[model samples]
Target: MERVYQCLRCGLTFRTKKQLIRHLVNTEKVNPLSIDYYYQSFSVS
Candidate 1:
């Protein structure tokens, strides 16, 4: 089975790694990796 990426704090699941990383950094303000600019595509609030 393909495990989907989930953010417990955000209550969301991502089918791919890219989506998961996007939410983590932008919404939760958690930096699992080094990034910027790409966050513009998504906004939690």
Candidate 2:
């Protein structure tokens, strides 16, 4: 199973869960807040 985060505005995707968490926490600091802070988790079996 793997978790991924995708940025709605830029369509940038992150495979690393840690990075996604960091981005969600620090989004306020970004010059332009990203609308895609929400995440979707899925698994491949």
Candidate 3:
């Protein structure tokens, strides 16, 4: 299982969930809906 913290508004990713939230609060004015954080699994064959 894998997860990532992302900002949908800017398509930005962070190594930590806190970093993403901090970014949203500072840059996005606490726009939680604009945050995209979840578990993701992908592979190329």
TM for every model, in the order presented, reads 0.61, 0.44, 0.57
Q: Which ranking of candidates, highest lDDT first?
A: 1, 3, 2
* Model with the higher TM-score, candidate 2 or 3: 3
Write model 1 residue lDDT over 1-45, tens digit each, in one string: 465666666567666668878787878877865433232332332
In candidate 2, clashing pairs total: 0
By the TM-score metric, which is better: model 1 or model 2?
A: 1
> lDDT (0-100) at residue 22 of candidate 1?
73
Model 2 agreement with the true structure over 22-45: per-residue lDDT tens digits? 665566343223434454444443
What C-alpha lDDT, on a 0 to 100 scale, does residue 30 get in candidate 3?
Answer: 62
lDDT (tens digit, per residue) of candidate 3 on 1-45: 346566666766676668778887787776656444431223223
Off by over 4 Å in 2: 1-3, 7-10, 28-37, 42-45
lDDT of each: 0.61, 0.52, 0.60
> Which portions of model 1 miss their true places by more than 4 Å?
33-45
Task: Quote the positional error of residue 9 for candidate 3 in Å.
Answer: 0.6
Better of 2 and 3 by lDDT: 3
Q: In terms of TM-score, which candidate is strongest? A: 1
TM-score of 1: 0.61
